[PDB]
Design an enzyme around this catalytic site. Structure first.
Site, PDB file in Angstrom:
ATOM      1  N   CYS A  21     -15.955  24.991 -40.452  1.00 36.27           N
ATOM      2  CA  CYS A  21     -14.863  25.692 -40.646  1.00 36.27           C
ATOM      3  C   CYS A  21     -15.096  26.433 -42.142  1.00 36.27           C
ATOM      4  O   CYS A  21     -15.588  25.803 -43.079  1.00 36.27           O
ATOM      5  CB  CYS A  21     -13.746  24.747 -41.030  1.00 36.27           C
ATOM      6  N   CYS A  63     -12.663  24.710 -45.088  1.00 36.86           N
ATOM      7  CA  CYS A  63     -12.936  23.371 -45.454  1.00 36.86           C
ATOM      8  C   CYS A  63     -14.254  22.634 -45.353  1.00 36.86           C
ATOM      9  O   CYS A  63     -14.400  21.335 -45.561  1.00 36.86           O
ATOM     10  CB  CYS A  63     -11.882  22.493 -44.740  1.00 36.86           C
ATOM     11  N   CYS A  70      -9.699  23.662 -36.637  1.00 37.12           N
ATOM     12  CA  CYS A  70     -10.234  22.675 -37.550  1.00 37.12           C
ATOM     13  C   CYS A  70      -9.187  21.638 -37.717  1.00 37.12           C
ATOM     14  O   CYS A  70      -8.093  21.837 -37.503  1.00 37.12           O
ATOM     15  CB  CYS A  70     -10.551  23.479 -39.010  1.00 37.12           C
ATOM     16  N   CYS A  94      -8.141  21.079 -41.444  1.00 36.09           N
ATOM     17  CA  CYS A  94      -7.167  21.679 -42.315  1.00 36.09           C
ATOM     18  C   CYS A  94      -6.488  22.863 -41.209  1.00 36.09           C
ATOM     19  O   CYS A  94      -5.929  23.781 -41.785  1.00 36.09           O
ATOM     20  CB  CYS A  94      -7.948  22.830 -43.367  1.00 36.09           C
ATOM     21  N   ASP A 107     -44.134  31.840 -31.398  1.00 33.12           N
ATOM     22  CA  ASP A 107     -43.471  30.246 -31.598  1.00 33.12           C
ATOM     23  C   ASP A 107     -42.516  30.088 -30.288  1.00 33.12           C
ATOM     24  O   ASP A 107     -41.646  30.784 -29.881  1.00 33.12           O
ATOM     25  CB  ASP A 107     -42.665  30.297 -32.776  1.00 33.12           C
TER      26      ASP A 107
HETATM   27 ZN   LIG Z   1     -10.749  23.450 -42.149  1.00 34.12          ZN
END
Ligand SMILES: [Zn+2]
Lengths: 393, 253
Positions: A159, A162, A181, A184, A309
C-alpha cells in the site's frame, strides 16, 4: 516547430507504460481511423517523428489526430517538444525501482498539465501519487470475491499510503486488479471504463463486455484483453459511436497476430516465447485452458540474447503444470538439466520428463508422440534455433 | 499467516515439516524463493509432508510451530519495510536460533539477522541484532560474478552467483558458510562467504543456492528432521534420493 506547432494542429495521444504500448497504439489507431480517417502514428518508435507528421495527407482544416508510442524514459524530453492532449498508461512492472520509473511519466504528464491521463486503474501504482492532470481509469469490474493476497511471488503489492500489504477482490495477473488495503482502506478507484463481463476465454481467444458492448479477440492471454480494453476506452473518450468502435475494432483486431502454429508429422504445435516470470506464468495460464491432451516442451538457453541468468525460471509459476492435461514433458535447450530440475520440483511425474541434449531430438520425439497436440515454450535463442531446424524439412 | 504450499496427499508421509517463509511475499526477488521449492522437494523425498506458511508483516511467529525458517532477499524498498517489522519477531527468532533449529537466510535476510546493514547511500538500517555480524556499504561498487566456496567443517563445495553492495563482517562467535575459492565473498578482504552459526546458514548466493547445491538442500532438511524426531532416525541416503542431481551437477564442468 520541428515538433511543437503540430501539437496545436493535432490532438496527440501518447501511449506509454511498461508493456502493451505497441499493441494498444496499433489497435487505438485502427479504431480512431474508423471515426476520423487518417491517424498519424509511429509503428516503431524524435526527429523521425518530423517525417511522420510531414507525410500527412490531411491539412490544417481537417480533424488531425496522432497516437504515439513513447518509451517511459523518453517521456519528459518529448513532453517539452510536443503537447499531448491525452496520456494512456498501460501498466508498470519491474525491469528484471518501479516508483522511480513511475516518476518519469508523472513528470512528463506534469509538463502538459491540461492533458487527461487514461490509466489502468487495476495497477495500484497508478493511484499511488496525487496528480495535477485529470485522470480517468479503465479496468476489470467483473464479479468480486473476498479480499485475498496475490501470489507471494507477486511484485509491487505494498500500500503506498500505509506500507501494509495489499489484497485483491479480483486479481487478473501480477499486481493488477481490484486492490484493497485492509489497514487504511486505500483501494482501487471507481473505474470510468468497465470490463463488466468475461464471457468466454480459451487458450486461443476471449470474449468480453466493455461498457455495454461485446468484443472478441482471437488470441489467448489476459494481458491481451487489457490492450483491447485500453484502446476501446480511448475511442469512447474521443466520443466514437458504439457501432463505429465495433467496426473499427473488428477491422483492426488482426494486429493481435495469431498463435505461431505449425506441423510436425501429424502433430499440431504451438511455439511460445518465454523470457520473464510474469510472461511465462501468463503463457502457462493460457495453455492450461486447452481442452485436449498435449505434450509440453520447455527449451532453456542462457545465451546473451536470452539473458545469461536463468534464476528467473524459479519465479515462474511452473507449478501450474500439475493442473494441466500434459501427457509427457520434454526438457531441452543448453540448460536442459536446470529446466528439467525446475519441472521435477513441481511434483510432476519425473518418469514423464525427458531431457534432450539437441533440439533435433525434441523434434523427433514430438514427431512420434501419441497425443495430437504439442506446446513448446522456448527462450529467445532456443526459439530461433527451433524455427531454423523446422526450415530444413 | 497463511499456508502458501502444501504437499499433496499422494504419498504416505511418516514425518511432518513446517516451513516459515519469513516475509516471503516481500523478500521474494531474483529466484531465491525457489529455495522453498527445493526444500519441499527434498523433504518429500525423505518422507516428510511439507507445509509452508507465509509469515510476513504483523504476523506473529511462534518458534515451536516451525522446523525450518527461510528468509530470502528483496528490493531495497521492501527490505527497509521488512526491517521496520522485525522487532515484532525478535524474541521468538532468538529462541528458535538458540534452540539450534534450522535457518536459511539469503542476501537481505542474511543481513537482517545481524546488527544492521547500510544502504549504498550511507543510510544505516538496524537488523534483528540476534547475530553479531554487520554489513557496511559500498559507495558505487558492487561485488558481481560467479563464486565458489568450500566449507571445511563439512567438506562441501557450494557454487553460485553473487551481486551485492553490502560488505558483511562476521563476529568472533560465528563461522563462515564457506571459505572463498574464487569470488568476492562477504567483504573481498578475508575470503569468507556467508555465515554458519548453530543451525543458521546464511549466504549471498543466488542460483537459487539449493537448486545449484543439493548437498546443502539435503543437509538442511535432514538436520531439521533429526532435530525434530531425534538423531537416532534413519533417513534415505543423499546418493539414493538425489542421484540424478548429483551426477548432473558434475556433468556441468
Ligand atoms: Zn494502506
Amino acid at each position: 516547430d520541428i515538433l511543437k506547432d503540430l501539437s496545436k494542429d493535432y490532438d496527440i495521444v501518447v501511449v506509454t507504460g511498461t508493456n502493451g504500448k505497441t499493441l494498444t497504439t496499433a489497435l487505438t489507431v485502427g479504431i480512431l481511423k474508423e471515426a476520423f480517417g487518417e491517424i498519424i502514428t509511429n509503428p516503431s518508435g524524435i526527429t523521425g517523428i518530423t517525417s511522420t507528421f510531414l507525410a500527412a495527407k490531411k491539412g490544417k482544416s481537417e480533424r488531425q489526430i496522432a497516437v504515439l508510442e513513447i518509451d517511459e524514459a523518453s517521456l519528459p524530453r518529448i513532453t517539452t517538444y510536443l503537447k499531448p492532449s491525452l496520456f494512456v498508461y498501460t501498466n508498470i512492472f519491474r525491469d528484471q525501482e518501479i516508483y522511480t520509473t513511475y516518476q518519469m511519466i508523472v513528470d512528463g504528464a506534469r509538463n502538459a498539465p491540461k492533458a487527461t491521463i487514461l490509466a489502468n486503474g487495476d495497477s495500484p501504482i497508478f493511484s499511488s501519487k496525487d496528480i495535477v492532470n485529470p485522470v480517468q481509469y479503465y479496468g476489470f469490474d467483473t464479479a468480486k470475491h473476498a479480499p485475498q493476497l496475490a501470489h507471494y511471488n507477486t511484485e509491487g503489492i505494498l500500500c503506498p499510503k500505509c506500507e501494509h500489504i495489499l489484497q485483491y477482490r479480483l486479481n487478473t495477473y501480477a499486481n493488477l486488479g481490484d486492490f484493497v488495503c485492509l489497514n487504511c482502506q486505500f483501494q482501487r478507484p471507481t473505474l470510468d471504463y468497465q470490463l463488466t463481463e468475461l464471457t468466454a476465454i480459451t487458450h486461443q481467444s476471449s470474449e468480453f463486455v466493455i461498457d455495454g458492448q461485446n468484443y472478441k479477440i482471437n488470441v489467448g492471454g489476459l494481458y491481451n484483453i487489457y490492450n483491447a480494453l485500453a484502446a476501446v476506452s480511448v475511442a469512447e473518450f474521443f466520443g466514437v459511436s458504439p457501432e463505429k468502435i465495433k467496426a473499427g475494432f473488428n477491422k483492426s483486431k488482426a494486429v493481435f497476430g495469431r498463435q505461431e502454429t505449425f506441423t510436425i508429422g501429424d502433430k499440431s504445435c504451438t511455439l511460445i516465447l518465454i523470457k520473464n516470470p510474469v510472461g511465462a506464468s501468463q503463457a502457462l495460464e493460457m495453455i492450461q485452458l486447452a481442452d485436449y491432451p498435449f505434450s509440453l516442451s520447455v527449451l532453456l538457453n542462457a545465451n546473451y540474447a536470452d539473458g545469461i541468468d536463468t534464476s528467473w525460471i524459479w519465479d515462474a509459476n511452473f507449478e501450474l503444470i500439475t493442473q494441466m492435461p500434459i501427457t509427457e514433458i520434454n526438457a531441452g535447450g543448453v540448460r536442459h538439466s536446470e529446466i528439467a530440475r525446475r519441472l521435477r520440483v513441481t511434483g510432476f511425474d519425473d518418469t514423464k520428463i525427458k531431457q534432450a541434449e539437441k533440439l533435433e531430438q525434441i523434434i523427433e520425439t514430438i514427431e512420434k508422440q501419441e497425443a495430437k497436440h504439442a506446446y513448446i515454450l522456448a527462450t529467445y535463442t532456443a526459439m530461433l534455433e527451433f524455427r531454423s531446424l523446422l526450415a530444413d524439412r | 499467516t497463511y499456508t502458501s504450499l502444501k504437499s499433496p496427499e499422494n504419498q504416505d508421509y511418516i514425518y511432518d515439516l513446517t516451513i516459515a517463509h519469513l516475509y516471503g511475499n516481500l523478500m521474494n526477488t531474483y529466484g531465491d524463493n525457489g529455495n522453498i521449492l527445493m526444500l519441499k522437494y527434498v523433504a518429500e523425498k525423505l518422507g516428510a509432508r511439507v507445509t509452508v506458511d507465509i509469515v510476513s508483516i504483523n504476523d506473529t511467529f511462534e518458534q515451536d510451530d516451525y522446523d525450518i525458517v527461510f528468509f530470502g532477499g528483496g528490493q531495497d524498498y521492501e527490505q527497509s519495510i521488512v526491517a521496520k517489522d522485525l522487532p515484532s519477531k525478535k524474541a521468538a527468532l532468538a529462541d528458535y536460533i538458540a534452540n539450534n533449529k534450522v535457518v536459511l537466510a539469503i542476501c537481505g535476510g542474511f543481513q537482517l539477522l545481524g546488527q544492521y546493514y547500510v544502504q549504498a547511500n550511507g543510510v544505516k538500517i538496524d537488523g534483528l541484532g540476534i547475530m553479531g555480524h554487520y554489513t557496511l556499504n559500498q559507495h558505487q561498487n558492487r561485488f558481481i560474478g560467479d563464486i565458489k566456496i568450500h566449507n571445511d567443517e563439512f567438506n562441501e563445495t557450494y557454487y553460485g552467483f553473487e551481486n551485492h553492495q553490502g560488505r558483511t563482517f562476521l563476529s568472533g562467535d560465528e563461522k563462515p558458510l564457506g571459505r572463498v575459492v574464487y569470488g568476492n565473498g562477504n567483504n573481498k578482504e578475508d575470503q569468507t562467504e556467508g555465515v554458519h552459526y548453530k543451525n543458521v546458514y546464511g549466504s549471498y548466493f543466488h542460483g537459487p543456492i539449493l537448486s545449484r547445491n543439493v548437498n546443502l538442500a539435503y543437509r538442511l532438511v535432514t538436520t531439521a528432521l533429526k532435530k525434530k524426531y531425534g538423531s537416532a532416525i534413519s533417513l534415505s541416503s543423499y546418493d539414493d534420493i538425489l542421484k540424478q542431481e548429483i551426477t548432473e551437477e558434475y556433468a556441468d564442468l
